[PDB]
């Protein structure tokens, strides 16, 4: 009996590939514009984080010397 | 056919280590 | 100096099951402790063994381990350690965890 | 006194948020320390399936 209703769960598919191929074809192109993107945004953060990094260390040693 | 799948273990999820290594290339740390 | 005597299909057969041997940790203990690692000509055949790692290469290899064991190996106080039997007792019991 | 040094202390905690909020934002983090062909993988992985089951 287990086996029968586990015949019923089943669901019914193609067995052709093409479906599925052609989803996996847009997902990969999809996160491959993503991932570029990505990239270009990630190389003006990292210029972005430099910047603010030498702010913050002026800061630093300037507050250090000052109040001490 | 066969297309390039770009995927980089991204299901999976030290400073230590870093610091052996740069003793290894450049010796001491002082320099 | 003896020449040579290999075979080309048998001896990329037998670099297959050499790698899978290199998966085994009480392989390593043993080769270990006959002092194998002492060497250099065995750790040059190691780095011959790099080439199991290419796509068309790896594709044919069983036992993922060894490659992992591999780059285990690359250190030399590693290679001490597994001619310990607690330390090789210690990886075993890793891989039969994750297995 | 005690006034006083209750300000001077309040102070210090400001310089402290400061700093904290900056140095929140810029999150600091160490350095980091090939493509694939779906059916050489998929080949591959259905292999190994037997072998990395029990």
Redesign the interface.
Known sequence: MQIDTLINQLPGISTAPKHQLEKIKKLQNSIEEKQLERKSLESENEDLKLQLAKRIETFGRLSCVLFQ | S??????GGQNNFN?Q??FQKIIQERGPFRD | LLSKVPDDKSRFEIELEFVQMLSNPWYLNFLAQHKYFEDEAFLQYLEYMEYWREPEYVKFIIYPTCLHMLTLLKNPQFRNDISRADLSKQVNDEIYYEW | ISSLLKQDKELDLQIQDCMREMTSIYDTHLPKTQKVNAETLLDYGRKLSKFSSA
């Open positions: 066969l297309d390039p799948e770009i995927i400073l280590q870093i």
